[PDB]
Design an enzyme around this catalytic site. Structure first.
Site, PDB file in Angstrom:
ATOM      1  CE  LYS A 150       2.749  -0.080  12.375  1.00  0.00           C
ATOM      2  NZ  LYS A 150       1.939   1.034  12.989  1.00  0.00           N
ATOM      3  CG  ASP A 161      -0.186  13.863  15.686  1.00  0.00           C
ATOM      4  OD1 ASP A 161      -0.724  14.562  16.507  1.00  0.00           O
ATOM      5  OD2 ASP A 161       0.456  14.005  14.487  1.00  0.00           O
ATOM      6  CB  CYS A 210       1.374  -0.060   5.067  1.00  0.00           C
ATOM      7  SG  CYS A 210       1.345   0.454   6.901  1.00  0.00           S
ATOM      8  CB  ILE A 216      -0.955   0.109   1.331  1.00  0.00           C
ATOM      9  CG1 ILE A 216      -2.123  -1.145   1.227  1.00  0.00           C
ATOM     10  CG2 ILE A 216      -1.573   1.307   1.131  1.00  0.00           C
ATOM     11  CD1 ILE A 216      -2.661  -1.436   2.291  1.00  0.00           C
ATOM     12  N   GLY A 217       1.537   1.510   1.069  1.00  0.00           N
ATOM     13  CA  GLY A 217       2.523   2.644   1.020  1.00  0.00           C
ATOM     14  C   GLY A 217       3.740   2.212   1.595  1.00  0.00           C
ATOM     15  CB  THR A 218       7.281   2.958   1.273  1.00  0.00           C
ATOM     16  OG1 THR A 218       8.569   2.924   2.180  1.00  0.00           O
ATOM     17  CG2 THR A 218       7.312   4.169   0.511  1.00  0.00           C
TER      18      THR A 218
HETATM   19  C1  LIG Z   1      -6.611   1.344   0.183  1.00  0.00           C
HETATM   20  C2  LIG Z   1      -5.773   1.307   1.234  1.00  0.00           C
HETATM   21  C3  LIG Z   1      -5.017   2.510   1.764  1.00  0.00           C
HETATM   22  C4  LIG Z   1      -4.720   3.641   0.781  1.00  0.00           C
HETATM   23  C5  LIG Z   1      -3.974   4.766   1.841  1.00  0.00           C
HETATM   24  S1  LIG Z   1      -4.025   4.191   3.490  1.00  0.00           S
HETATM   25  C6  LIG Z   1      -4.749   2.724   3.282  1.00  0.00           C
HETATM   26  C7  LIG Z   1      -4.625   1.809   4.260  1.00  0.00           C
HETATM   27  C8  LIG Z   1      -5.823   0.821   4.460  1.00  0.00           C
HETATM   28  N1  LIG Z   1      -6.045  -0.173   5.501  1.00  0.00           N
HETATM   29  C9  LIG Z   1      -5.216   0.358   6.709  1.00  0.00           C
HETATM   30  N2  LIG Z   1      -5.284  -0.430   7.937  1.00  0.00           N
HETATM   31  C10 LIG Z   1      -4.393   1.297   6.634  1.00  0.00           C
HETATM   32  C11 LIG Z   1      -3.416   1.653   7.651  1.00  0.00           C
HETATM   33  C12 LIG Z   1      -1.899   2.351   7.739  1.00  0.00           C
HETATM   34  C13 LIG Z   1      -0.923   2.132   8.904  1.00  0.00           C
HETATM   35  C14 LIG Z   1      -1.743   2.644  10.080  1.00  0.00           C
HETATM   36  C15 LIG Z   1      -0.898   2.932  11.201  1.00  0.00           C
HETATM   37  O1  LIG Z   1       0.127   3.396  11.097  1.00  0.00           O
HETATM   38  O2  LIG Z   1      -0.999   2.435  12.465  1.00  0.00           O
HETATM   39  C16 LIG Z   1      -3.256   1.911  10.324  1.00  0.00           C
HETATM   40  C17 LIG Z   1      -4.150   2.143   9.417  1.00  0.00           C
HETATM   41  N3  LIG Z   1      -4.357   2.141   5.421  1.00  0.00           N
END
Ligand SMILES: CCc1ccsc1-c1cnc(N)c([C@H]2CC[C@H](C(=O)O)CC2)n1
Ligand SMILES: [Cl-]
Ligand SMILES: [Cl-]
Length: 247
Positions: free
Chosen positions: A31, A127, A16, A12-14
């Site tokens: 993560k 946050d 995750c 998903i992202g850097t």
């Molecule tokens: C479509 C998926 C997406 C696009 C931007 S964020 C995201 C996504 C989807 N499901 C998740 N559970 C999360 C996270 C990212 C990491 C986070 C944290 O830092 O604890 C929890 C939610 N992002």
């Protein structure tokens, strides 16, 4: 448990990643954290930190399921809920591009559901920024853990030297949801601080009701004791059952 119990689908992202639990095919997220270069002290903090995450169960807080240690590649995986709608930052960014404002109904859901998240955090004592607010697939809004830039959301008190401080930040967040820009903008923190102490900003766009503008305006009061409490927020006639989380 073990990483082999899951299959990565993609990043998903850097880091995750969206993953699938083999036992029942459930779609999750994990993560990746590489502790190989951490001191024993940094790791003990990490252990306790992760410990406080498993404790928090709430519909409006991203649910964590598991921690997974792979000592071979020195990686810790934190397995969590998948929030298919992504984060709130991208929603605001997107709105800005297509020059399309968000529905008041969506702003009311976010206000309601984040206020309930805050109430929980306060009770158990994150946050409050768009990048840390996530959407699932059923209109639910979830607060995450993380938890050079200009500090757009810094409150007047937390800028000199408080639960009303969270209310200010939520105000800033909902305001930014409506206007597609933060209440106070500036090129340097000093200029920013200047504008905050003054407490002046534009009305959110006219497509939004006076009642929504009023409550966001109250949250942005310069006096923390004039800002509404979580309780006072949820007593607002704007807020209805359908604005809350649903399974
Ligand atoms: C479509 C998926 C997406 C696009 C931007 S964020 C995201 C996504 C989807 N499901 C998740 N559970 C999360 C996270 C990212 C990491 C986070 C944290 O830092 O604890 C929890 C939610 N992002
Ligand atoms: Cl616009
Ligand atoms: Cl305007």
């Amino acid at each position: 448990s073990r990483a082999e119990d899951y299959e990565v689908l993609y990043t998903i992202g850097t880091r995750c990643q969206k993953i699938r639990r083999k036992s029942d095919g459930k779609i999750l997220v994990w993560k990746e954290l590489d502790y190989g270069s951490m001191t024993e002290a940094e790791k003990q903090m990490l252990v306790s930190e992760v410990n406080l995450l498993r404790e928090l169960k709430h519909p409006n807080i991203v649910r964590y399921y598991d921690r997974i240690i792979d000592r071979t590649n020195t990686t810790l995986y934190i397995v969590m809920e998948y929030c298919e709608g992504g984060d709130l930052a991208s929603v605001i960014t997107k709105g800005t591009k297509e020059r399309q404002y968000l529905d008041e109904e969506f702003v009311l859901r976010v206000m309601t559901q984040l206020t309930l998240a805050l109430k929980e955090c306060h009770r158990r004592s994150r946050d409050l920024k768009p990048a840390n607010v996530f959407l699932d697939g059923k209109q639910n809004v979830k607060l995450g853990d993380f938890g050079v830039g200009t500090p757009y959301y810094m409150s007047p008190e937390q800028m000199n030297r408080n639960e009303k401080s969270d209310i200010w930040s939520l105000g800033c967040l909902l305001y930014e949801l409506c206007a597609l820009m933060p209440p106070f903008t500036a090129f340097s923190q000093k200029e920013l601080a200047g504008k905050i102490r003054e407490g002046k900003f534009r009305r959110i766009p006219y497509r939004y009701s006076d009642e929504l503008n009023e409550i966001i305006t109250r949250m942005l009061n310069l006096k923390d004791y004039h800002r509404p409490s979580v309780e006072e927020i949820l007593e607002n006639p704007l807020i209805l059952e359908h604005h809350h989380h649903h399974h």
